[PDB]
Symmetry: D2
Subunit: 462 residues, 4 copies
Amino acid sequence: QDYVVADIALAGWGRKELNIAETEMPGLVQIRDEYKAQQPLKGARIAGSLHMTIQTGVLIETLKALGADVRWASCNIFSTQDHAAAAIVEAGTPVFAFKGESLDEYWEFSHRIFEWPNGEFANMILDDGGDATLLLILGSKAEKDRSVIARPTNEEEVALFKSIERHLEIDGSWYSKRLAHIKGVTEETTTGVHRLYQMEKDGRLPFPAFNVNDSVTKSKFDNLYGCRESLVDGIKRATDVMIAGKIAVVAGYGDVGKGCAQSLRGLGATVWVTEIDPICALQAAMEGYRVVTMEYAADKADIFVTATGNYHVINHDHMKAMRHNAIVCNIGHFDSEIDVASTRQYQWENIKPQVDHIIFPDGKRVILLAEGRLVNLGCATGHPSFVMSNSFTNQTLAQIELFTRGGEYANKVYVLPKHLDEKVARLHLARIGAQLSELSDDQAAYIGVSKAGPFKPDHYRY
Amino acid sequence: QDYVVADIALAGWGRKELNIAETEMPGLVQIRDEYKAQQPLKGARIAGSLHMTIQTGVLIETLKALGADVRWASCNIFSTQDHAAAAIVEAGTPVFAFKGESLDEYWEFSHRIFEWPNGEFANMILDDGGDATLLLILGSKAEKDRSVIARPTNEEEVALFKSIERHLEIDGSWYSKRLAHIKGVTEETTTGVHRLYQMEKDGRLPFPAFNVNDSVTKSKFDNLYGCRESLVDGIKRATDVMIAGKIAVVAGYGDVGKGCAQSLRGLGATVWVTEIDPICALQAAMEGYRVVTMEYAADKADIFVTATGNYHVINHDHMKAMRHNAIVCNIGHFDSEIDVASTRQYQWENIKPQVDHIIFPDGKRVILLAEGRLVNLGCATGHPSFVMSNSFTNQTLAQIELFTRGGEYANKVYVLPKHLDEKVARLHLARIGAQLSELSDDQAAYIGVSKAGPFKPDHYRY
Amino acid sequence: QDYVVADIALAGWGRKELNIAETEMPGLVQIRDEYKAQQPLKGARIAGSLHMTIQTGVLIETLKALGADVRWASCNIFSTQDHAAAAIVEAGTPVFAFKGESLDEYWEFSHRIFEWPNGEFANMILDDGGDATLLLILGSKAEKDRSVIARPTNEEEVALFKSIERHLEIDGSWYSKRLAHIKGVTEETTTGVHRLYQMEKDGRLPFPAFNVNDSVTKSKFDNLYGCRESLVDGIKRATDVMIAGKIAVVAGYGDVGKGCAQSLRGLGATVWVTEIDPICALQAAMEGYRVVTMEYAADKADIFVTATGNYHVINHDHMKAMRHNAIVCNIGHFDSEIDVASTRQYQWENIKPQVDHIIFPDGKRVILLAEGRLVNLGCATGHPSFVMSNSFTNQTLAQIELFTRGGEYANKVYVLPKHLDEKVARLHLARIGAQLSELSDDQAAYIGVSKAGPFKPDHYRY
Amino acid sequence: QDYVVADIALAGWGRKELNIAETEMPGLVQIRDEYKAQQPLKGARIAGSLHMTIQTGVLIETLKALGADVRWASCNIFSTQDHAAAAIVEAGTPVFAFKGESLDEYWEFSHRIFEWPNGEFANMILDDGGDATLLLILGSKAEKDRSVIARPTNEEEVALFKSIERHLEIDGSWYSKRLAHIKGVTEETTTGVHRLYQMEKDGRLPFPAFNVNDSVTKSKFDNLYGCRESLVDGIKRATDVMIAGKIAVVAGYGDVGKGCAQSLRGLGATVWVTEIDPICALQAAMEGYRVVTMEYAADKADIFVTATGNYHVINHDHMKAMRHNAIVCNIGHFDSEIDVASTRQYQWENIKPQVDHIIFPDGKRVILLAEGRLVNLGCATGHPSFVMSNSFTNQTLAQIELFTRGGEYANKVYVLPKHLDEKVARLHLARIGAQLSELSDDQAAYIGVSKAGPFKPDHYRY
Ligand SMILES: NC(=O)c1ccc[n+]([C@@H]2O[C@H](COP(=O)([O-])OP(=O)(O)OC[C@H]3O[C@@H](n4cnc5c(N)ncnc54)[C@H](O)[C@@H]3O)[C@@H](O)[C@H]2O)c1
Ligand SMILES: NC(=O)c1ccc[n+]([C@@H]2O[C@H](COP(=O)([O-])OP(=O)(O)OC[C@H]3O[C@@H](n4cnc5c(N)ncnc54)[C@H](O)[C@@H]3O)[C@@H](O)[C@H]2O)c1
Ligand SMILES: NC(=O)c1ccc[n+]([C@@H]2O[C@H](COP(=O)([O-])OP(=O)(O)OC[C@H]3O[C@@H](n4cnc5c(N)ncnc54)[C@H](O)[C@@H]3O)[C@@H](O)[C@H]2O)c1
Ligand SMILES: NC(=O)c1ccc[n+]([C@@H]2O[C@H](COP(=O)([O-])OP(=O)(O)OC[C@H]3O[C@@H](n4cnc5c(N)ncnc54)[C@H](O)[C@@H]3O)[C@@H](O)[C@H]2O)c1
Ligand SMILES: Nc1ncnc2c1ncn2[C@@H]1O[C@H](CO)[C@@H](O)[C@@H]1O
């Protein structure tokens, strides 16, 4: 049994929903059809680390339709949809993912995507959050300097470092030998891409990487419109709270915060925003959101949402000040946005899976969602299929490009060229009935672009 | 065992959520506290027929805190939250309610709320949708004229009429004897209140009734803001569909449609509305919604929502014309808004509980939600606690008024007086930090109201 | 010359805008066509007191096209569009109105509408604000008891009482003789309707009156959608201020206030609301507006709008607390919502017409718009033709009904019947392409209404 | 007299609006204060071509307060606020601008800004639309090759080429000698920036240029939030039209189009969008706008707005298909977005200044605003002071940088550095009460940025 999932019997259900998702994911479906004859991913062995949702399942089977062999884990302990995992396993793909797996299991699963049978090796990583990339790179450092895994500072590191030891005892060259085969990585999210840029700035990036997050059709769609639908979806499945009339504070006003702000406002919440970037602060103010400090908000707001990709944006003292039954969640990639660890000293009382009461010594309780893990994937199902098709069409193009032409790329982070970004968006217009217009020759000459595009300069912000 | 619920072990969970709901239902909590000394519902035996949600559980225990003895059923086969039912049963109240009960069970449960031990009788009905009221009134007619239950036209009637026969065999005077004890009814929803007005117009209303639906603080809050949060909540738990970019058609633009329209629009759907009332049509047009016929929409839209309280607003031919994987739901009180029965000839395939594919002969499938039953309660948890407190504070006041002073009322439908409607709203202002201002004497004289209110004439529409 | 306007040479311009307005006012065009053959207003001599705008112009000519003879004045010193007045005069109707007329000129003009030649008398009043009606009623009381005009409380009353004295000296029976000839009044605004209810309550109302404000198609349209467009229109023409990022406080959350709030919010203002009505306050809070006191708001907010119909909602001390270049305006009917009189002790500096700096002793200045008079009409053109067609279609039907059938009505305040309200709405659907659907026979029977309507019970709030 | 304005007597009014504007433009006030001691623009002789509004007035005086000597013209024939021009002249700056100037006057005025007394020369251009820069470049080319001014394609070019001929006859070296003295250009609008990129591409750019349009704080603010306020402002002053219920089509969904769409939607319009860029089209569709062709829209829509920066987006046949009293306007930089020339074959009837009826042969009329010139500036006052402060703070910094350090830049198009973009934003926070939060040391290390910023990578799109 080359997989670990919750219950293989959930497969029928997963498949019914994969069927539906295809009709909602025209980018993936049209890319299957365009490229299946060519079989461009034949000989690709893709280790994927990414929320094992129905949406990811349509991606996985797109990669396979194009010839890839694939092994998959989730990039969060709570993001898996078990019926998605089951259907993908049933259709022949190794998946090491279930909702609620432990941290030790998580990291073990990150190794398993790198354990191919019959002497083969993964030669591509599809990463969301940089954990698969991290594991190989940190594991390899550890081979030559055990000190890099000696001093864990948090439970994530205890688990990661432990799993590395465990693998180094088995084979002293476990990581470096697998690293050597990786042709490149395609990375989905802002936090992951941040990790790649830091490796680039440091000269420790050992292969080419695509930054899929910053395709226009990704950052400005998925991060934004996707959270605009799924933040509240997560909060409500967790708590069934009324939004109208509440004071919701969104920490961070990038694309994820913009989406979050917009969905809370739409339902009649008073929306406050917190920011360190004055440009983004001014944008928030220009939409009518009050821009405040977290210290100012902690004792006043009803709902707190971290969307920063930063560390300890909600800390012990913010939570100590909150009103009784304040709801606290994180929609950023990592749970460290909230100092959950500092509340463990207090008595907790579980309400239901992923909804916990933290009881402070004066009896005041905070309702914490998904133990701080991404709330949309943890209490709901993450973004809907339609917008996820943008991100995953990008992913599929990036995987094709690196597998087929990676030799043309240096050890740098790249973004897909604008013409492909434009293609991704174009493939989604028909599903929703949008009629694209066409430049006349005279018009094309007048604004200095080709009728076929690209239509915008490379610094354009959309 | 004087109850029927899914699983008594869900009680702990139900109670945790009732605890939270109290902090979200300041109207109910403050009314408990104001009246508990007086015990105004001492000697009240309230038969309730109403969605057995967490929110209803806080209502039930408010009635009990005020001295009522209570027996409860749900007013929809799919609206029960089983953990709510379990906690209320565990705290000592007979509940005949579970999610997914059959139609025969439904109507049997409607009898059970009328079966009190030790020779007692219910003397108050708390009704949502008019089913408890209907049962006693139709049962009593049946006693003298069996022809009124002879010719059922639909599965609801087959079940109702069967359950009446079954009870008339036991006791030929089953209904009339129980009817004789009812001091009055308080009725929660537009469809229920419509049934009461028809009985009034016909002179078959045998006791006083309160129309709780048309308290301003009910119709204009619950129906409107409540659907503004829970329609999409239901659609997404069912289907996880993206709303942005879809064409959503809302049939009906009363308070329920207004709320629905507003939440679809907020998430970036193109919203079309259907109406028979030109005033409401013009309101919809004034918000930017295209007002179209269902015949025009059927082959074009992505998501269909009936919010009319009417019959067959989506019929066999509309559904036959729909695009593949169109989502069809109803948020009106009764499932007859959609002619579900006309699709039974086709092959169905269940996706998950309350989400079904209807496969037309050309292979095109429609995704029907909750078999047409109210989608917010059926695929989600109905309105959130906060707005439900308005409706239920109203309910509690209406029950107090009829139990204590029903002798002062004729056999007519009444609405609560404006001063109480205003009180209901006032009790909710503190939770959300709204600061009410006060008229000066000069101001009170100038606009001709008392400083204490009421502030508006009786025809005011808010 | 039987008129007083600013400039007759503006007529050509007014006529061109009247042509355009007709295509924006389908209710009035269709009513002219429907009733042309009958000439129901033949023999009607209508005295009108209503903002002399392009829109009122189309109303005047509709009344004349149905047979009425008309004389007109504006119901505000700053709301006349002089090109409108000119075009209406040039086409044969006496008009006594110009933008910027003094208060003495105002009340002289309200007498002129009651000075018909050849020994004739007005037999109908069409009023907005109730000033035409007040003139004749107060004047008649003054004939027998001068004490009623002994105690003016503001400049408008000083001017009104002077005008009554002056006319009484010419003819001690000037008012009573004209008052006797009035067969009915149609009153279209909330403040005037309050004045009429107040008269009915005290047995002082001598002819039948229609409350046109409380047609659904007036109140819930003109007051709301109109101010949603015209409030910012007025403030911008006056000040050209950015709305995005500002704190805007709306005093009063009735229909006008709802419109104002929604307008300011859409441009990215933070919208605060002030209310004495807890229901209206809870509505505001459910849209995400903060509900605060004026004392709280005075030293924080950027823009202040009064929308109450009440007295001294912004007082001296509020203004003294305001930030430099705070903008203060009123959109309610009378300027007394703001205590402008209390600021006359300070230096003022005119910025441009209807835009003044009030210079406080510390050098802090407040920007007051239109000396507190209704800002949308004073600094812009009021509501647009389209929505006004609703109100004026109601007015036209109201006039027809009282003039032709007034004998059947008591000396009380009436509202138009629902079927007529629905007609008003229906007449406006085609222009905006809204398609009304039609009940089937079964559907009509199912909800217990006729196919032709009316569709809602009289208490329905829409 | 070294100026040409409509009326010097309007100065007092302009000065009072300049005082107010200063309190709305904190970036410009703070920049004057920060750089007053240094006088960085001492010795700068700035020729400006930019809408002569109150806002540009504050910019002019900011430049003068930092030492610059200035001469100014408007960059559009209809966008001057004459009270603004008057107040700027009265305070000592030559201005050659008035609302309604002819095209011959326009281009004569663009020469006058380059006629400095006492043998001096402009050494900086501040341009909006690129007309000042075009004048000198084209003119210099014309000195050696008259064929470049042989083939005008529209009336503005006819007038431009006439003006070049005329000046060449006086001095065959008129342009080249002035062109040599230009040390730099700062260009603030998208169309002018396109003209500059086009010049760099062809080796024809003879001095360093700043693209100020593409400061985040310009493009994503002025173009968007400005048009969200000023588009409807312009259309309403021109036509007073109801927006609610109308179909409004926005050609182009760049920053301007996004602003326009959002404005129209907020007032209850049905908003359709036209786009040739599939990404911009998908963004529009994700807000619920229908994406349609102009051919589709022409006979259906009520209001048409061009926002493309392209040519002949509304053509003759579009206008011929339009409904009676369709409203047509343009908000892009040049009027050629609409083919107004093709309508001159028809009778026109002026309604009022910048509002014309185009009378078609079947009697159908179209309302054209401002002869196709930018409608917000032509029929209203453009964007409000607050947002313009962003753009003009960018302009001021751009001028300082090129004048003081221009020698370090190549003859290429540059953008301001992010830290300066952030500063612009930061300067505007206090006025609107937005509180910026500050990274802790660990947080700064965690996301790899400095506490002082900049906070985002150069590709960040906001
Ligand atoms: N849960 C999801 O489905 C989802 C979807 C997309 C991206 N993400 C993740 O969400 C996070 C945010 O992504 P993004 O694309 O918006 O990134 P972003 O960089 O565009 O936005 C982050 C913002 O947070 C602000 N910020 C940083 N530290 C702050 C602090 N201490 N206080 C207040 N603001 C602070 C920054 O100014 C920045 O604008 C990332 O971790 C990303 O991987 C999650
Ligand atoms: N699911 C929930 O949580 C919820 C909440 C409150 C009320 N309700 C129920 O929802 C239904 C609607 O309630 P409401 O308060 O909005 O009633 P309403 O009377 O205010 O609105 C119904 C609207 O439907 C329109 N209509 C009737 N027949 C139509 C047809 N064939 N096509 C198009 N429009 C038609 C009417 O013109 C009317 O405006 C009722 O059955 C009520 O009991 C449900
Ligand atoms: N400018 C216009 O084009 C326009 C249009 C329609 C009506 N009006 C006028 O606007 C005014 C309001 O009309 P409406 O239809 O909204 O009336 P409304 O009665 O519906 O609303 C007024 C609201 O003000 C509140 N209020 C009263 N005093 C207050 C105070 N001291 N502080 C805070 N809130 C207070 C009331 O509680 C009420 O909800 C009237 O004078 C009416 O004639 C103006
Ligand atoms: N009036 C103002 O106050 C104001 C303010 C800022 C900018 N502008 C001007 O507005 C214009 C647009 O500026 P922007 O910043 O939005 O530019 P942009 O490049 O960001 O947007 C223009 C959009 O138009 C689309 N387009 C081009 N041709 C089209 C066609 N034939 N049909 C449909 N869509 C088409 C492009 O694809 C692009 O997305 C420019 O001329 C600019 O100088 C005016
Ligand atoms: N969470 C909830 N708990 C109890 N009742 C709820 C509910 N959500 C909706 N409702 C109610 O359903 C009615 C329509 O049957 C409506 O009148 C009323 O809103």
